[PDB]
Design a protein around this ligand. Structure first.
Ligand SMILES: CCCCCCCCCCCCCCCCCC(=O)OC[C@H](COP(=O)([O-])OCC(O)COP(=O)([O-])OC[C@@H](COC(=O)CCCCCCCCCCCCCCCCC)OC(=O)CCCCCCCCCCCCCCCCC)OC(=O)CCCCCCCCCCCCCCCCC
Ligand SMILES: CCCCCCCCCCC(CCCCCCCCCC)(CO[C@H]1O[C@@H](CO)[C@H](O[C@@H]2O[C@@H](CO)[C@H](O)[C@@H](O)[C@@H]2O)[C@@H](O)[C@@H]1O)CO[C@H]1O[C@@H](CO)[C@H](O[C@@H]2O[C@@H](CO)[C@H](O)[C@@H](O)[C@@H]2O)[C@@H](O)[C@H]1O
Ligand SMILES: CCCCCCCCCCCCCCCCCC(=O)OC[C@H](COP(=O)(O)OCCN)OC(=O)CCCCCCCCCCCCCCCCC
Ligand SMILES: CCCCCCCCCCCC(=O)OC[C@H](COP(=O)(O)OCC[N+](C)(C)C)OC(=O)CCCCCCCCCCC
Lengths: 85, 106, 55, 48, 82, 90, 76
């Protein structure tokens, strides 16, 4: 079959963020990064990247768990919490 | 009904979630969809600088109605999730030893 | 390789023996009465049928 | 004695596990009820 | 719930086939195809309209016409080769 | 001065046997709902919806299929019939 | 409360909490319940005529009003 690991979620979410353009720049990226402040997002293109990350992993997010993945690391372990890939 | 806040942010972040997801299943094409997505992105960016509560609430409730009318019969769901087709196919049984009810017979 | 195994089970379970034995005995007994009817003109079980005459 | 047998069988000869066993009803349901019922079948079939 | 809806639609049609089967065994006195088709051209036409309408509601329920189509589409919850 | 006898030796009642451990967690809401439905008749009262249901199912529907059953007793024979032949009698 | 038959059984209940009937399907799926399948918390009060608002009840469509849909169907 096809397994994911956490290396993969890492290099997919960062891949997703380097092709997004309204980020500040492509190398202040790491797992620790606030999307609010570090990458210079407004309150609604954090929502455009939540939509992009949920179509990216093929999964769907309710509104009360989309709001709280504000860091990249919370997003990575939240996407790793689900069995679907 | 409220200016710049955490709760008004909560409300229209979820409304932008909803209209993006709702526009997702109308449009078959990719670039027609993303032309349309940048178009309503523009629609959200022409607003969000209103300081009134009167017409902030009036625009808020009618874009809620405008969101209500363009609703879709089938949402696109991934199948292993509660709208989908792979949902609860082989639920693994929980590990339970046998409780017994009779002194003489199993 | 292939599928994972589970422990070995004997084929002739007690229910296989019981149900097969009873139904094969009934079919054998039916064929025995159809054997006996051609030789003697009557069933082997109607030997044991002794009701009173109607009058 | 029956009490000491069955409560030990429930909590735990006691300390073994196999399947050869006859409960109290199987003597006269397999050897009296079941052949009488098969007899009833045969009498109905040849009485027809 | 999908298997429940499919079998209850089919059971609707089965009730109408039991009705038509009762009229078959009444009018012709038999269920055999040979006797029924040997004597079919003689029987009254209102009788045959009653019989064939009941048997058609049966056939219409199982072969999924417009009054009763809801269970085919609701039978995709069973797997692909089913 | 009227006390039952000194020679009684009365003692407590037991049902006897084995206390089976609890295989089922009770639900207070389901138990209250089901106890409410089982004994529904002692809190039943006559209303307009009740009267509608009572007249429709106890008098109206019996009178209707009674009219149908008495009008149609010796009407139909379908036993052996042909084209151009009556299947009713009256 | 909301339905007409739920209103009809109002005077028969006594010592019974008189819940607002809400369909168990139109609840959120992503709120974690004790049973995810029936979408119900463990001691939650059951309505009268609860088997009309259970998960095992009819499907209860969301997109059209029922009088609208009868007009559209008899229309076609
Ligand atoms: C042909 C003629 C046959 C006649 C009938 C034969 C019956 C045999 C009975 C028997 O075997 O003895 C055991 C039987 C008790 O069964 P048991 O095995 O001891 O069960 C206890 C254990 O739990 C059982 O053991 P367990 O603990 O493991 O339990 C597991 C359970 C499993 O758990 C379950 O869930 C069971 C599921 C339900 C099963 C019950 C339904 C059985 C359906 C039969 C199949 C129908 C298929 C449809 C037909 C398609 C054909 C076109 O096991 C089962 O019960 C399985 C049953 C089916 C097994 C069948 C295996 C057969 C293999 C045969 C192979 C053939 C080889 C031939 C090779 C030929 C080479 C030349 O004892 C009896 O003798 C019963 C009496 C038999 C007579 C019945 C009544 C007859 C008269 C009726 C009255 C007359 C009409 C009324 C008149 C009223 C007044 C006017
Ligand atoms: C716990 C239940 C107990 C068991 C229930 C079964 C009890 C039997 C009840 C049914 C009952 C109606 C009762 C009405 C009140 C219902 C009260 C309900 C319970 C209240 C607590 C049906 O009787 C009538 O039903 C009418 C309804 O349609 C019909 O009227 C119309 O005409 C039709 C022309 O064809 C139309 O077709 C139809 O369309 C019409 O409408 C008639 O068919 C019929 O007259 C009772 O009547 C019975 O009475 C006896 C007379 O003793 C009759 O036999 C008689 O015997 C001699 C005696 O004197 C007579 O000398 C003799 O001449 C006669 O033969 C019976 O034969 C029977 O008739
Ligand atoms: C004249 C002939 C030509 C006619 C052509 C037009 C026909 C139109 C009428 C068709 C009637 C079809 C038969 C009706 C019974 C069908 C029952 C059924 O399908 O149950 C389905 C229901 C589940 O359905 P649902 O939940 O929506 O789908 C699940 C899939 N996700 O299952 C459940 O919810 C279980 C609980 C409800 C079960 C049904 C209970 C009410 C049934 C009432 C039927 C009454 C019929 C008799 C009426 C006369 C009585 C005197
Ligand atoms: C009779 C026409 C009824 C119109 C209903 C309709 O609106 O039809 C529309 C469908 C759309 O289908 P779609 O583009 O593949 O996907 C869904 C795309 N939506 C969600 C944007 C709609 O187009 C057709 O199939 C019509 C072409 C066949 C018409 C006869 C030739």
């Amino acid at each position: 079959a096809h397994v994911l690991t956490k290396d993969m979620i890492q290099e997919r979410i960062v891949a997703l963020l380097e092709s997004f353009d309204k980020v500040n720049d492509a190398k202040n990226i790491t797992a620790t990064a606030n999307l609010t402040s570090d990458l210079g997002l407004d309150s609604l293109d954090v929502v455009e990247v939540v939509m992009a990350i949920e179509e990216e992993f093929g999964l769907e997010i309710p509104d009360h768990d989309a709001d709280e993945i504000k860091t990249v690391q919370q997003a990575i372990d939240y996407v790793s919490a689900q069995p679907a890939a | 009904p409220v200016p710049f806040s955490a709760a008004n942010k909560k409300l229209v972040t979820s409304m932008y979630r909803q209209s993006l997801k709702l526009a997702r299943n109308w449009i078959s094409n990719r670039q027609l969809f993303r032309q349309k997505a940048v178009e309503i992105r523009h629609k959200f960016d022409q607003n969000a600088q209103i300081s009134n509560p009167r017409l902030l609430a009036r625009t808020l409730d009618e874009t809620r109605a405008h969101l209500y009318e363009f609703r879709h019969p089938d949402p696109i769901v991934p199948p292993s999730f509660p709208g989908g087709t792979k949902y609860e196919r082989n639920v693994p049984p929980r590990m339970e030893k046998i409780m017994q009810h009779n002194l003489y017979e199993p | 390789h292939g599928p994972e195994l589970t422990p070995a089970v004997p084929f002739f379970q007690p229910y296989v023996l019981k149900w097969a034995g009873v139904s094969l005995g009934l079919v054998a007994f039916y064929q025995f009465n159809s054997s006996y009817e051609a030789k003697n003109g009557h069933t082997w079980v109607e030997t044991f049928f002794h009701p009173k005459s109607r009058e | 004695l029956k009490d000491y047998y069955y409560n030990g069988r429930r909590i735990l000869w006691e300390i073994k596990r196999e399947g050869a066993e006859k409960e109290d009803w199987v003597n006269q349901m397999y050897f009296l009820y079941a052949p009488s019922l098969i007899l009833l079948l045969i009498v109905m079939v040849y009485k027809s | 719930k999908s298997a429940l809806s499919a079998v209850l639609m089919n059971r609707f049609g089965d009730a109408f086939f039991v009705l038509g089967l009762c009229v078959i065994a009444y009018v012709f006195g038999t269920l055999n195809y040979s006797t029924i088709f040997a004597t079919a051209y003689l029987i009254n036409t209102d009788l045959l309209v009653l019989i064939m309408l009941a048997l058609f509601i049966a056939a219409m329920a199982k072969s999924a016409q417009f009054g009763l189509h809801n269970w085919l589409t609701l039978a995709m919850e069973g797997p692909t080769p089913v | 001065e009227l006390k039952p006898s000194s020679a009684i030796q009365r003692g407590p009642l037991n049902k006897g046997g084995w206390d089976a451990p609890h295989a089922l967690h009770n639900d207070g809401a389901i138990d209250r709902y089901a106890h409410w439905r089982t004994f529904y008749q002692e809190r039943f009262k006559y209303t307009r919806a009740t009267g509608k249901s009572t007249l429709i199912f106890l008098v109206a529907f019996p009178a209707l299929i009674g009219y149908v059953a008495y009008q149609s007793e010796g009407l139909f024979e379908f036993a052996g019939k042909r084209r151009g032949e009556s299947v009713t009698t009256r | 409360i909301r339905a007409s038959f739920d209103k009809a059984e109002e005077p028969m209940l006594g010592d019974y909490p008189d819940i607002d009937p809400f369909p168990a399907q139109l609840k959120n799926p992503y709120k974690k319940y004790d049973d995810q399948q029936d979408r119900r918390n463990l001691e939650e009060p059951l309505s009268v005529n609860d088997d009309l608002y259970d998960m095992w009840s009819p499907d209860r469509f969301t997109h059209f009003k029922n009088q609208d849909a009868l007009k559209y169907f008899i229309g076609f």
